Design a protein around this ligand. Structure first.
Ligand SMILES: [Zn+2]
Ligand SMILES: [Zn+2]
Lengths: 132, 450, 49
């Protein structure tokens, strides 16, 4: 409900809105937030990989406040890259997790549909990282 | 350097508009606080966070400021507003109650608490808090701001009174009228006071005109006292026509003249209502009520002798002319000539500037509904519902499509008679009913729910 | 005989059947997850637009 509250306070006035629409949005917001108070569900605070800070960051968060190290997306399912396993193609160069491909059995790149084998591409990215 | 602050502000301003990053916007003031704390730094980060609409961090910063500044009633009201805007009503209410218990001599705090209590839909406590403080602060009459607070309290009391009215009651509530009259009197007094002090007064003038409009609508809704409304609306029109409000503000006069058009339509005077409609046309070319009333008056003048010819002539003269187009669509449905109807809708759409106009979309939905096609008609009716006008008709047509797809008699005596289809259609009808109860009328809503 | 088999093997959908999978979802999805919205006093139908 924290993200819902942020989205609702964003939605109340973007640039311009008729009075009836704004009143309806406020009615929806007050109904939702007076049925029960905003409760934060617990989750796993995985250790951060962007920097050396011991302050763990929430799984959903990608902003990485106070560090400035934003995380690259994974075009497979949207999860941020929190592991060494990430590769990309030479057509769209987007990070991609091995486990997501294995679960989804994706024969092509999710964005650009590059028709090249993912196993050899993982090997090539591993070689490139070894070069670095 | 004395211009260091301005330099940093400008550097910030070229760092959110050229590079488009909110994080750096926040960081610009974050470094200002972190480098050296002061008695105003938390206030300015709170202001920046409000400008970016991040209520929780601003509330935390204002809490730190209130830690630094002992009383600082400005930080008190800022904290109250921030905690009200964070969509956490329990802690905001607790803070309001604590502050009221501490110092019961803060009128702004009482007004904010009343607004929050109205928001949470707790009328009893809200009224029990509003009435004593508003009825007691009658000793500082010469002061301007105290008069403004009294006016706001009376307005919110009237709003509370009108909120607790179950639908279907047609008894003119006198206490609301008296409270609104006191509010307009105090607003006139404070307008005079603001004129005395050489301050901008047109905003008070326009808000008083809006309150006049609300009073006129309230008095027209229940008791048909046409002369009193006519006089009040003339006074309001004279009251919004000072300074440079002629050109800058146009929605106010639009609402006044729509209201006048509705009253003249009720009074059954074609000439005066036509003159008012001409005034609307000179004001706003995209007025829907003017076109609908003109179509109705033309129907009154001619029905079946040569109405089709003059309607086609008017369609030829004016490109869109949506109301006459809808009437012609109805006639062509009545005469099995939907092909020339399609030609006419294509011709009107070719020069419609914007495709998704409410009138054109409504006409397209009606034409597709009359052509034995429910899907596209439903889509167009849903698209055209996004307006003040045509909402009731579109919702009724959608409900009829959901309930009666083949356009047959509702109850067939030959066999069964009711028609039951799945479960989602009924829930969609319920959603349309919930929209109609706030947008459409009350009697049609009753018919549809029945 | 080979022409039909090869064409069916490849069959590049040019225009006609690029994405033709149109089935009413305004009613199909509303049965999937809208039940606790109607059960509670919540109106999010505006957001679903
Ligand atoms: Zn980190
Ligand atoms: Zn790619």
């Amino acid at each position: 409900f924290r993200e819902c509250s942020r989205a609702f306070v964003k939605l109340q006035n973007l640039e311009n809105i008729t009075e009836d629409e704004k009143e309806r949005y406020e009615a929806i917001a007050v109904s939702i937030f007076t049925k029960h108070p905003p409760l934060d569900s617990p989750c796993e605070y995985t250790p951060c990989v962007g920097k050396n800070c011991s302050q763990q960051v929430s799984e959903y968060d990608i902003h990485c406040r106070a560090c400035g190290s934003n995380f690259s997306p994974c075009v497979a399912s949207g999860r941020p890259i929190f592991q060494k396993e990430f590769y990309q193609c030479k057509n769209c160069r987007h990070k991609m997790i091995e486990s997501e491909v294995s679960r989804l059995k994706l024969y092509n790149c999710a964005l650009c549909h590059s028709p090249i084998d993912f196993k050899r591409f993982t090997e090539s990215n591993n070689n490139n990282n070894n070069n670095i | 350097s004395p211009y260091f602050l301005r330099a940093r502000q400008i550097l910030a301003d070229v760092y959110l508009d050229q590079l488009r990053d909110r994080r750096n916007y926040a960081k610009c003031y974050a470094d200002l606080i972190e480098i050296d704390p002061s008695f105003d730094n938390y206030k300015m980060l709170g202001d920046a966070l409000m400008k970016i609409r991040e209520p929780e961090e601003a509330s935390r910063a204002y809490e730190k400021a209130a830690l630094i500044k002992p009383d600082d009633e400005q930080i008190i009201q800022l904290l109250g507003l921030s905690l009200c805007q964070t969509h956490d009503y329990n802690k905001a209410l607790t803070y309001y109650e604590n502050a009221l218990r501490m110092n019961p001599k803060r009128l702004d705090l009482i007004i904010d608490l009343g607004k929050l209590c109205i928001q949470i839909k707790n009328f009893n406590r809200a009224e029990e808090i509003l009435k004593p403080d508003i009825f007691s602060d009658e000793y500082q009459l010469p002061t301007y701001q105290n008069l403004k607070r009294n006016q706001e309290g009376f307005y919110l009391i009237a709003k509370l009174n009108i909120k607790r009215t179950p639908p279907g009651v047609f008894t003119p509530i006198d206490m609301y009228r008296k409270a609104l009259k006191k509010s307009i009197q105090i607003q006139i007094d404070v307008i005079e006071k603001a004129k005395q002090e050489g301050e901008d007064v047109e905003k008070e003038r326009k808000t008083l005109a809006d309150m006049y409009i609300e009073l006129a609508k309230y008095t027209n809704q229940y008791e048909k006292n046409e002369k009193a409304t006519l006089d009040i609306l003339a006074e309001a029109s004279k009251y919004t026509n000072n300074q440079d409000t002629m050109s800058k503000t146009v929605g106010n006069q639009e609402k006044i003249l729509e209201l006048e058009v509705q009253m003249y339509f009720k009074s059954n005077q074609k000439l005066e209502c036509e003159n008012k409609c001409n005034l609307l046309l000179k004001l706003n070319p995209n007025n829907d009520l003017a076109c609908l009333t003109l179509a109705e008056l033309l129907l009154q003048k001619d029905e079946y002798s040569q109405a089709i010819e003059q309607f086609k002539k008017i369609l030829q003269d004016r490109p869109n002319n949506y109301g006459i187009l809808a009437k012609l669509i109805d006639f062509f449905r009545r005469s099995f000539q939907i092909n020339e109807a399609k030609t006419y809708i294509e011709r009107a759409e070719k020069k419609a500037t914007n495709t998704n106009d409410p009138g054109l979309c409504y006409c397209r939905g009606l034409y597709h509904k009359y052509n034995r096609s429910p899907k596209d008609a439903l889509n167009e009716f849903s698209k055209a519902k996004k307006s003040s006008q045509y909402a009731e008709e579109s919702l009724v047509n959608m409900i009829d499509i959901y309930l009666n797809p083949d356009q047959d008699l509702y109850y067939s005596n030959v066999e069964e008679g009711p028609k039951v289809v799945d479960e989602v259609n009924l829930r969609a009808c319920e959603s349309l009913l919930r929209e109609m109860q706030i947008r459409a009328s009350y009697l049609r809503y009753i018919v549809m729910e029945s | 005989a080979q022409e039909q088999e090869v064409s069916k093997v490849s069959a590049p959908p040019n225009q006609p059947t690029v994405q033709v999978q149109d089935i009413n979802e305004l009613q199909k999805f509303t049965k999937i997850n809208t039940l606790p919205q109607t059960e509670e006093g919540v109106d999010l139908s505006q957001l679903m637009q």
